[PDB]
Symmetry: D3
Subunit: 233 residues, 6 copies
């Protein structure tokens, strides 16, 4: 249908989990969904529709960076009528308020991108999630015993940053971690009147430098997946 | 004590209600609090401490615009040990999702100010409130039967806007109303690790040109005062 | 009849002195004017009309910060037909060329605000006073034996500055002191074709850390008040 | 080795062809290379090493947008010792000087991204290719009888542009087409002292709305693949 | 002694008239000065020293645009010890407040240049003249019966403007005319603690389209030359 | 026929050499052209038409800085029908890849000017030369045995820079030297669909402070002049 998704109209459920890595999307479909069908694979960016506890759920990869995320989110909403979009992924922690295995809920997404200035009159758009989705994540995390850390993330155009000197100031201003898409997901969902939320798993701390083991990374990812799937049930 | 507040340290309770209008602050003290004492009056900017249903509450005026709000909020946090700041004020609606007398909870505060770029590396700071406070507002509104409208506000340096052609675009991006301080409150609370939230009551519609009458403004604002004081109980 | 002023049309004289602190405005009315009447008091922001040497003069408080000052100046000019606006205030000196008790005339007001970029095509607006008013101030200060220091001021959105390291650079470029409203007064008066000027009293030096005593401040303030009233005579 | 490439050091030849679409990279490996080996597959972003007319060549996908392209290019240069990077891809034409199936050589990449301002002192970085590579492309095109169109491209953060009213201005300034990665490839190669060039095939005209059929897209792209492989011989 | 001036140290008087056109500078020396000596001629940019009514005066061309003006002004102040710089020149009127043959005194110089943002913390520098020179010009014009028009000018990087649709907005904000150097003269003088002022003669009205005949242009410019030379006597 | 050129329509050949210094332009006409006629001299900015090896060639001075260069290039193209513009000049080297007597071909011109943001939607315009002209220079240089250094230059609004600390960063990003006009020449030629190229001879090194003697200055300049005239034959 679109240049970036070759799903049929109606192949997506109204609730979609998102992740930058299509191989992690494939992992979720294989391990946690029943009767998962691969509904799109343009550019090797996979998406699925399947069932979780008898409920329809879609998954979609969106690549790295705001520009990539924006393309997929725009088509999911405008063409495939996706209504709720829940991004899960990893991040680099920068605040002493979080450590390994923590799950962050981004109630705002700051950015060094110019995309929101281009969208929003050259002013400051405060990119935020849908509040109802954030309430649902908080309530589901509590039911599951997850100690959800809530604050801003900083969405960067740079994985190899030229501004590492600024990470301390970012953390002072309640930015818990750096990632690369949340500001784009949030601004696109605001633009198109859809519900979006970003959860981040702390696998690595950019300041204190601790990393999770390959085992621990699978453990903490599964914990975030279950949280996400449970709030969409 | 500070250049803008002449209270003694300890005169403020750790929870403070904020409003731009010190005469409205005084109105709250006299109508809704018991044992209210005026604790500060520099520049005619009144603040009070009293009790609501047996619990200590402080009230403080903060003037108009981000620069004025930032001064008072900075001093309340750094000198007077205030931990939770709840702003209530009026706003001008720009979205068809809200009408006169609606109460808005601002989950983000966009802005045309340069203050957050100066604070934050010339990048985009997503100015947001404390999540626990937003949860408490949502829950209290539900308990009180208030249909709380949740979205962004646009915090402007301009009461008399030069960009009225942009209001529809702002509304498209889930900005429900315009006011002039929330981005400053949120950024300062982020800077200084305090908890802040902004609620606004729709007194005028900037699109449909509807306005509240003098009597209706008092009654609508009373509803927001009760919501704020019940959140702080 | 405006949202921020509750005077009647015609209550203001065409010449108006301005200051951010309404209590200092009230001080001027009480000590220096004859038959002074309080003509507005919305938000406790006081204004007066009275006589000085048989001549009608008004006074108006405008609060702190460019956004607040702009609101009041806009309404004074557009609704209350004020034609000449003379702001007197305090400032923090940053230049070795001025010391305590000096009176500064701001022939330009630089700023870290975005307001003039929003007003002025995203270019650099050189915010300046009306020249005839500056001439009148120089001529009156001479007649009164006042050694008027003349130069730029820097109008900041920040009382608690994040750029104190930059004060020496400001002083190098002939900024004698920092305050928080002049650039908004000047830009608004240019927008609306009115005559404006800012005079500042050096009460404190942000570099040498010198400060006047409470009685020296009142004496220095009175000197500037007499200068202002004499140039409106 | 790197977080986005799981090839061994030494798996990449020093010359690498780049494309956003890893499935088109796989297609090139299978149709045009002999003895092609898949050497990386993190995030389904495939890369290959093989031979063309007896000469070793590598291929690598880089995803969509400047932030994604920058990640892969940085790791190719810094870890895998790639010295020459030739990007081929599709673009949307915006100039009447180019039609469908034309091949464009980008001698400059303008952008709406903030990435180069962050890299380059908040000034204007002229993102350009290596001249020797551009000479080689021009000569090879002549040899192959290709009518190579030479000019700037515009690298956008937006596939779904909010500034379509500006396409004619871009074309006036000798921007032949829009794509989404060249400015990031060029700036990264300049940062790290490597040789880069971008060639683009016109599959759609954004002004005339002409679009190639899926069949002739393949045939048109094959011509650009051969130009690229020939200039790397 | 500098790369753009080949005068000897001491060849300049401490008061210097400036004009963009070195041929008009030569005209002034030959028509209005006695004992004029050509003292510099690098790049054909002439400067002179002579006497007017027995008093020493220098003249110097500075070329077109802020960058050119800044070079010559910088060298005049730092190497040749010039203390007072009076620029005279033509301008394109944009305000109904001025007409042909009017002489404008620029009490501020707005600009579309980035030079002052580079100089001044990326904030807004209000580029202004020296007050004492402004007073002297006003007083001398009164003495000579000249109706001096006083306001801002807009110093553009563009003679062939791309923003002619904004001339009305510039005039609204008290910009009487456009020229191309005043903001650079003023900022350089501010940087280096020298006294500068710009006077401009209205030869063309960019809005009204009235224009001076070749004969009236020479008469009008002689009027401004006499004002300038009388000011420095 | 234009405000800055007093040549007749048709006095210019379609190929024009440019330099900032009109005395260098005059030097070229005297030493290398036959039957050279001075065709323009407004503001002492000289231009010539003559013959080199029996082919007509024009020369034009353009003064210092982007604003000045833009004026003359605009008039040459729009009024005098100039089609190919080859700028030759000096520059201050900043890279270890070049030394004194080197000739640089600027395949891009970065800048600290705001001019291209004003021209180009407030985005990043990659100012580049015409590729065919760059090819001609490269081939002509090779024929003459000149070791042409190819890369970016940085076009500054500042001769007396306030950002000397950034020169190493500029060199990292393949900026070989600083000059003051190339970005303006390139952007104007792009605007107006003309062919432009800039060559720079390294006379001074802004890093190591090496400089050429007066005799090596003329020798190096002559080598670049011959390159330029030979390219236009």
């Amino acid at each position: 249908m679109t240049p970036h998704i070759n799903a049929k109209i109606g192949d997506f459920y109204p609730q979609c989990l998102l992740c930058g890595d299509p191989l992690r999307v494939s992992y979720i479909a294989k391990k946690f969904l029943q009767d998962a069908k691969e509904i799109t694979n343009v550019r090797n960016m996979l998406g699925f529709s399947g069932k979780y506890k008898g409920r329809g759920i879609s998954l979609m990869g969106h690549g790295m960076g705001i520009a990539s995320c924006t393309i997929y989110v725009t088509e999911l909403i405008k063409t495939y009528q996706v209504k709720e979009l829940l991004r899960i992924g990893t991040c680099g922690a920068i605040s002493p308020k979080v450590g390994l295995k923590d799950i962050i809920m981004a109630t705002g997404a700051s950015t060094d991108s110019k995309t929101n200035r281009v969208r929003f009159l050259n002013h400051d758009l405060s990119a935020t999630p849908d509040f109802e989705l954030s309430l649902r994540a908080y309530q589901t995390a509590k039911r599951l015993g997850i100690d959800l850390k809530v604050g801003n993330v900083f969405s960067s155009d740079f994985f190899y940053s030229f501004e590492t000197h600024a990470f301390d100031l970012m953390a002072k201003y309640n930015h818990l971690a750096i990632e690369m898409e949340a500001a784009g997901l949030y601004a696109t969902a605001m633009e198109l009147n859809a519900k979006a939320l970003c959860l981040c798993s702390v696998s690595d701390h950019l300041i204190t430098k601790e990393a999770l083991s390959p085992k621990e990374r699978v453990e903490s990812f599964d914990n975030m997946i279950i949280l996400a799937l449970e709030m969409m049930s």
